[PDB]
Design a protein around this nucleic acid. Structure first.
Lengths: 261, 261, 261
DNA sequence: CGAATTTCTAGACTCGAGATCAGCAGCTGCTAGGTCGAGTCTAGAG
DNA sequence: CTCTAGACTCGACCTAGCAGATCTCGAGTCTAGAAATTCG
């Protein structure tokens, strides 16, 4: 039997907002120790993983692990209506093909009741292999969002250069080219200002800007975003949702020969 | 000869903002007791009644009771150019020639003025009957607006029942079914953020959500709003215009088709 | 080599988004006195002249005076990426046809470097016959912007007949007519609201308000319009660039003989 | 600092013009119109 | 009186569509979402 009580409904609001456009349908896996979400893009290049644990949840109970197939557009539409301060009372009736959602109120005089129809999908599991990443960078989410948004205007692809003098983003296009660079900040002890960089070997890659723009939408979830990559491996973008879990992104680097044509 | 000083022109601004998207023509019955307006919708489904009291205006005088037909869409278009805190002394000539507007400024430093023509139209008078209603509910207007706007995401008809503990706002859209119940609380000392119902006999009806969304456009007029309905009786929505008067909204319930057969 | 270091990049941003919708290519003149710009419009109706005195720059140097051709729409887009409080370092080097732009964070933590390509153009000298003016007014920019925007609703031709007691911004249209009148007041302690007018000869003309809508975009630069007007002379409105200089705007009044057919 | 307000922007919708297409008739000769190059008139200087 | 250079005229010369249905496309309009602003 599945029940779930959450205090900060804004967390679910932000999660569904971030996941709304990149993915439309997903297999909502549920465990007895937490919630796991892993699906894939229609264009089949980007991979998303979610790790909503159970301890952070106010009330968690799952007798048997299930797997719900649910339209993410419907979840976003429903969840946006509820306010950003209510109480989430997620509950799934066993084999009922329906997920029950209940919204309370801080003053406890108005409650919400919504029912929506599950959609049966094909469960596809892809065990992600782990490996070291040469360049590891953590830096404030807002600056990253602004950087990606600005570089969107100029061109279409970005050349990350994890140079030891500070990361130097670079773009190009028929309207000229630009390159924004930062510096390793050590004096400021504030985490919301850290530009901490981990260096193993200089690297250089390339990624489509539109997918990075899509990825940056999860900014309200947290202030700090971590980057990691290495030679010819998919990009790692990490978001930390307080303590109930972490949200990750995976983007496959472009090929240099794609610039030739 | 007609004159009417309106110190709070914003009230009439919002009034025309509300009525604009429903009925495009109206014959304005003017009397020494005040200004009257009654017009029935284009689709012949809903009726709109408006009442203005003479004593509310700072200055108001009507030698002979008047009636003019005038477009409201252009009226609203020119009103949208007015400031939110202007002073209006709406005046019209004794001869049925045109319409005069006396736009002003709070600092008495600049004055605007517009001229509009009038078109004679049929004075189609329909006898409104006066009957009591089994169920009458008062409830904060913002909550009603939010409820209707949210339910618009689901379907086109909402089942409503004046329940023992409150109301039964619910709709069954193709995507799913959602229920919203309002706890009938009267222990609240301040009546503005409170709900109250007279319960006479159980009722159950349904309406059109698009028409409700159009109905709720007048939300900033007042904090409260009164609903009234009975068996096969058209639904009554009343908006209190501060001390100017009341705005009344009419909608017959959706006829229950013999879809069961 | 040409260098320009404007501390208040907001100024350049504002002038650029003001001119973006009127000129697609304009020659740029530099001088030890300062930068100059004069460019007649695309539709061959209005003229735009801009003064950029070098004394206003925190740092300026120009060995020899060149004439560069620069697009503007691309400049508007590229400068949109600039922040609101950054230090522009506009620089063109030697005979290279590339324009260098450098943005620095106020906290000097995010160093943005850009690049623009210029193209050669015809440098056409166009004489401006200076003369005296009959209807010359000084009046707050926001009021003029609001008036023109509101009158855009009424129609497409205004007729100012500058009044002995103020102005006569009257206009008409198929819907009707509207004559906003502003009383001339000089009993203002501060100069931010004065509407002082010099009146010597009667005057009245006609102009197109689409050009006026393009015309008023420069509102954020200052707050004191210095509109001047005289017998059958092209219309002139000037905005003061804080203390650096001025931006003059030129449009010939529409000939009423062309309204015969 | 949070929320309401206002403003802006971008995407969906509609309309008018331009292009394309599947089929026909059985014809290409005529009409409008634009260009262009050469003949020729005329004014000023020798 | 005659030679010569520029503008006007005339003749020559060329050339594009031939008929309806069907998309297609580009420009204009509206609205909803976003973002900036401001005030208590």
């Amino acid at each position: 039997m599945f029940e779930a009580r959450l205090v900060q409904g804004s967390i679910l609001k932000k999660v569904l907002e971030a996941l709304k456009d990149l993915i439309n349908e997903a297999c909502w896996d549920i465990s007895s120790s937490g919630v796991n979400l892993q699906s894939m893009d229609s264009s089949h290049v980007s991979l998303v993983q979610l790790t909503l644990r159970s301890e952070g949840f106010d009330t968690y109970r799952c007798d048997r692990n299930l797997a719900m197939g649910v339209n993410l557009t419907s979840m976003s539409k429903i969840l946006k209506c509820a306010g950003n301060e209510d109480i989430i009372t997620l509950r799934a009736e066993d084999n009922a093909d329906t997920l029950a959602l209940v919204f309370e109120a801080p003053n406890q005089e108005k409650v919400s009741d919504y029912e929506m129809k599950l959609m049966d999908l094909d469960v596809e599991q892809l065990g992600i292999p782990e490996q070291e990443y040469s360049c590891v960078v953590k830096m404030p989410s807002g600056e990253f969002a602004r950087i990606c948004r600005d570089l969107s205007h100029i061109g279409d692809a970005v050349v990350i250069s994890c140079a030891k003098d500070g990361v130097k983003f670079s773009a190009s296009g028929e309207l000229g080219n630009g390159n924004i660079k930062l510096s390793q900040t050590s004096n400021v002890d504030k985490e919301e200002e850290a530009v901490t960089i981990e260096m193993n070997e200089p690297v250089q890659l390339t990624f489509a800007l539109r997918y990075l723009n899509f990825f940056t939408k999860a900014t309200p979830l947290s202030s700090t975003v971590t980057l990691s990559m290495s030679a010819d491996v998919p990009l790692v973008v990490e978001y930390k949702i307080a303590d109930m879990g972490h949200l990750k992104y995976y983007l496959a680097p472009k090929i240099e020969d794609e610039e030739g044509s």
